[PDB]
C-alpha cells in the first residue's frame, strides 16, 4: 500500500494531489488508441465527480 | 469545468520516446521537448504548428495556454496564434498557418505588441483586441480563452509575477458562433527578425 501511495505521488508532477489523464499516461510503444482506452477506463471507474481528476482515495478505491 | 486530457499537453514528460506529443500532431519546424514545445525557434523564416489529432465537440470550453516569446530585439517577430478551427490548419502566412479557416484565432502579434481575436467562416483571407507586451517577460505568459454561452473572453496573465492565477481582462466577443466540432491548435512564425515561441502547456476544459 505504501508502494501504491508512492506510485500515486510519483506521477503527480504538478503536485495538486490529483491524477489527471496526462499524468496517468506516463504511469503505464503502446499505441495512443490503447492508451486512450486504458485512461478512459480509469477515469470512468475512479472519477466520481467527472471533473477529469482523481484523488488518492478514488485511485485506491 | 472538466479537464480534458486528450486535448491537452504539458511537461515534465510532454514528449514520448519517439519524439511525438500524445494526442497532438506537429508540423513545420515545431520542436517538442520534455517541458515545452518550441513552436517556432529564433531562426529566420520559420513556421511551425501543433494541432489536436481529433476534433473536440464541446458546446462550451476553456483553454489555458502557458507560453514564452523570447528574443534579443526590443522588437521581434512574428508571434504566436491560438486556434479553434473546424479543420487542422495547413501551413501558410498567418502565424505559421493557412489564411482561410473556419473558427477563431487569438493572435499574439509581435511586429504592437497586440493581441487580436480574428473570426473566419472558411471563406475569408478583427473582432476585438488589446495591447500587451507579451515578449521577454520574467515568468510565463498565460492566455485563458473561454467560450461560454456564445461569448469568447480572453484573459491574460502578463508574466510579470510568479502568480500563475494573475489574469487580467484583454478582450471579449459577444454573440459569437464557431464550429460545433473543431481542432485546437497553436502556430507560430518568424521572418527576418525571430523570437523563440515556446508553449509550456495547453490545458483544455469542457464547461457545463
Ligand atoms: Ca496532478
Ligand atoms: Ca474527480
Ligand atoms: Cl491540469
Residue numbers in the entry:
A (entry chain B): 70 to 97, 111 to 143
B (entry chain A): 44 to 154, 162 to 175, 186 to 268
Excerpt from the paper describing this PDB structure:
Incorporation of the cargo glycoproteins into the transport vesicles is mediated by transmembrane cargo receptors, including ERGIC-53 and VIP36. These cargo receptors are termed leguminous type (L-type) lectins because they share homologous carbohydrate recognition domains (CRDs) with structural resemblance to leguminous lectins such as concanavalin A. ERGIC-53 (ER–Golgi intermediate compartment protein of 53 kDa), the most popular marker for the ERGIC, functions as a cargo receptor between the ER and ERGIC for certain glycoproteins, including the lysosomal glycoproteins cathepsin Z and cathepsin C and blood coagulation factors V and VIII. ERGIC-53 consists of a CRD, a stalk domain, and a transmembrane region along with a short cytoplasmic segment. However, biological role of this stalk domain remains largely unknown, since binding of ERGIC-53 to its cargo glycoprotein cathepsin Z or immobilized mannose was not affected by its oligomerization states of ERGIC-53. It has been shown that ERGIC-53 forms a complex with MCFD2 (multi-coagulation factor deficiency 2), a 16 kDa co-receptor possessing two EF-hand Ca2+-binding motifs and thereby operates as a cargo receptor specific for factor V and factor VIII. The data provided a working model of cooperative interplay between ERGIC-53 and MCFD2 in interactions with FV and FVIII; MCFD2 binds the polypeptide segments of these coagulation factors, whereas ERGIC-53 captures their N-linked glycans.
Hence, we performed further crystallization screening using a different construct of MCFD2 (residues 67–146), and eventually obtained well-diffracting crystals with a different crystal form (space group C2). The Ca2+-binding loops (residues 155–161 and 176–185) of ERGIC-53-CRD and the loop comprised of residues 98–110 of MCFD2 along with their N- and C-terminal segments gave no interpretable electron density. Although ERGIC-53–CRD and MCFD2 both possess two Ca2+-binding sites, Ca2+ ions were missing in the ERGIC-53–CRD crystal structure. This occurred although 1 mM CaCl2 was contained in the crystallization buffer, while MCFD2 held the two Ca2+ ions. The absence of Ca2+ ions resulted in disorder of the sugar-binding loops of ERGIC-53–CRD in complex with MCFD2, as previously observed in the Ca2+-free form of ERGIC-53–CRD alone. In contrast, the present crystal structure along with the previously reported crystal structures indicated that MCFD2 assumed an almost identical conformation in complex with ERGIC-53-CRD irrespective of the presence or absence of the Ca2+ ions in the sugar-binding site of ERGIC-53. The Ca2+-dependent conformational disruption occurring specifically in the sugar-binding loops of the ERGIC-53–CRD/MCFD2 complex may explain how the complex releases its cargo on the secretory pathway.
